[model samples]
Target: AYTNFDAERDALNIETAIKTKGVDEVTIVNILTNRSNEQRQDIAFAYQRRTKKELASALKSALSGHLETVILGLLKTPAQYDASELKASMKGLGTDEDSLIEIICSRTNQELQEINRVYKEMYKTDLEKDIISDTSGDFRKLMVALAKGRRAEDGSVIDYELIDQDARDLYDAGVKRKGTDVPKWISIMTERSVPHLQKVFDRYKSYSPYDMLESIRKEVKGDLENAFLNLVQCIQNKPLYFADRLYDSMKGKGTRDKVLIRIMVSRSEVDMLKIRSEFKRKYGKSLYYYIQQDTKGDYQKALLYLCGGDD
Candidate 1:
């Protein structure tokens, strides 16, 4: 159930939590995670008015490491957070291409356009320009197209024959040839709406022995492959894809706390329940179990709350 929240008292509690000796991590987690994003925003605004200090800045000052990242991420609007995530991924010597791919490939055209606007407003730079500067090869072409936030019309009419041709075209481009035609894959993936692409993906199966993703895995290489795979996986089943991502975040040596936080924070209001169910189905373990086992301190508590519950 969504919290019938009290951001005003929550804000006061958060101030005390931050101001008290050693900082109360549980209070931070409890207050922030229980509330909705709008509630969080209200708290941030009221927090500034009440205390004359920005809540995000205060949280930043008080916390460190993964916990700090999670809280700070929750405070921003979704578009603002995406803009910041994109900026951070592109910063430093080498770019975080996977982060860029994960973010850009998965979002809808409208979401992408909003991110573009937020990116420009916040950073005084065009998102597509930065994408061009940082990425290279076919992957760059894909990212540039996605950053523009343009897609084919969401027309009511079904075009099964065209979809069939697209499937054949995709097969001919990759599976039927010595070298993969990168543009062919890029164009169809970026241009088609999700529902249309679903038709294309289904039709693609008839044209090749391997499924679309299997073909992508075999044909493409490196970031380009990852980019293609990301698009297909997202379209196929977004919740399952994200569930797998959350599971991957906690797997192997150490946790990918950033990814865990990103998926949880972004999807909590959207489809975290479906993701949780998918996690249980795929991993045979609850997402809550891995998170509880891998993470410690108030971070775990907050994540659990956002998770809604274990399946």
Candidate 2:
């Protein structure tokens, strides 16, 4: 609404952040860095979903070489992975149950539908069928929940018993299991709103001596656990919660590359500026600097812009 007041540019920074940049990472960075993460990726997604060329492709031509590769790696990862990838992940190869569960489990309702769409598109088979082949019972239930991606809006007839059991099953999956089940963790996190989730959290706490968050971390490893934990924390406190994700980003080699990209891509519009400000206020280093020192070209521009800085 602030720019030239044209119907398009006046719309908001998010869409323009990508369309304006025309998919160049450097240009994408220049526009996107100032927007929020989710907003940018969503817009980048819109740009790609609308344009069909990979946003990464445009970014490469617009950016320099080294910075180009890092941006490309992130772009190669779909804004969200589809079930086609899930099929590949579980099909012929060793079942990387972790990846299988994480992708299926973590996706939102609409995302699940897309995964189902993609899964069918790739193998001409059902996502549920592939999952059934890969997993069973509660684990399978969780995977189905994720792939069902049933939003309240879906208007699918609901069995109250199913919802209750789902909650219980989810808690049981995380609390009592030998190892963390990513799908179960995802089911619990994605299944409800904050208020309802609080009850689940309390119930989870009641079932175990350990805290829900810590137990999840201890039980699960890698992406599913991490994404599940993030969803849990997001349920708890949207702002304060993501700090854990940020912590993970900087954990091992000083920064998690994928995570950094995830944050840079996902949260830029939603509350990323708020998160960035909070990070600086809490940690004293500029996220801009972190991106600047660690990345360049469009990644840097978009990341910086999202933080409310001049890129």
Candidate 3:
């Protein structure tokens, strides 16, 4: 929680800053970025009450480009942000399959459920329907299963026998059989708890000719391969998975600004601090260093603030 968080006062401060001729972007960034997402919600509501205008609309009008994107993203609750991102991913002619896979494969059962609810509310369409229409075959199957939010809850007693069975099942489905049983692979990956999946993946090496990741590479291609790989990686180390995604978003020719904005905003209050440490450990450069290298001006500053600190 933000210390001494006075929503009304922040609302007034934001009004004063944005009401100015040029718009005090620094002040806007500092106040919004400093507050917690929950606090930010309160500030938005207060700003609405104070000015009879939505703060999201206010910020959108005042700022432009990626700065506007980041600031407006900050104003949303995590679920709303996620639902909106999911919508954006599937909105156009071609799907942003990477974004769809990342959000669906990474979110918890409860989190996904919230996203589903908000997706329908916000778009008047079901998330699963959107995904089905946009994707096909085994990839669509796995994505739909994961979106159902039926994964076993973590923190329960682990069943070693079930774990071994799952390991054997996956081995039979992929490496042992002449043809892959995509449904079996989907079931095991989507239904098991994180700890159980971790064990299953570990035990899988004993039964299969190759490790889990290697086997996936052999059995599947295209977006399905990516989705399966992301699921396995996310179960093992979500922060590190995100660390790599963050690196990928900035490392190549042009910046994947949509990915950059989504991860930075969505994870800011979640595991960004941990993600930063993982980024440094794996890449040997702080996320901050890459952001500065890849972005410019106010957009860079806002992302840096969301990053929390450099390692």
| Predicted model with the maximum lDDT | 3
**Residue 85 lDDT in candidate 1:** 95
Q: Order of all candidates by lDDT, from best down to worst?
A: 3, 1, 2
Between candidates 1 and 2, name the one with more favorable lDDT. 1
Q: Return the TM-score for each candidate structure.
A: 0.95, 0.55, 0.96
Candidate 3 differs from the real structure by a C-alpha RMSD in angstroms, to one decimal, of: 1.5
- Best of the two (2, 3) by lDDT: 3
Question: lDDT tens string, model 3, 119-192?
Answer: 89999999999999999999999999999999988855889999999999999899897889999999889988
Residue range with the least summed lDDT across 10 consecutive positions in model 2: 2-11
What's the lDDT for candidate 3?
0.92
Residues 1-311, candidate 1: write the lDDT tens digits: 33424667788899999999999998889889988888899888878888999999999999988888889999999899999999999998899988898899888778888999999999999999999899988889988987787888688988888888888889999999999888988888888777888989899888799999999899988998888888889988999989988888889889888889999988999889889998998889899999999998778888899898887
The clash numbers for all candidates, in the given order, read 0, 25, 0
- Please give the CA lDDT of all the candidate structures: 0.88, 0.55, 0.92
Task: Judging by lDDT, tell me the better candidate of 1 and 3.
Answer: 3
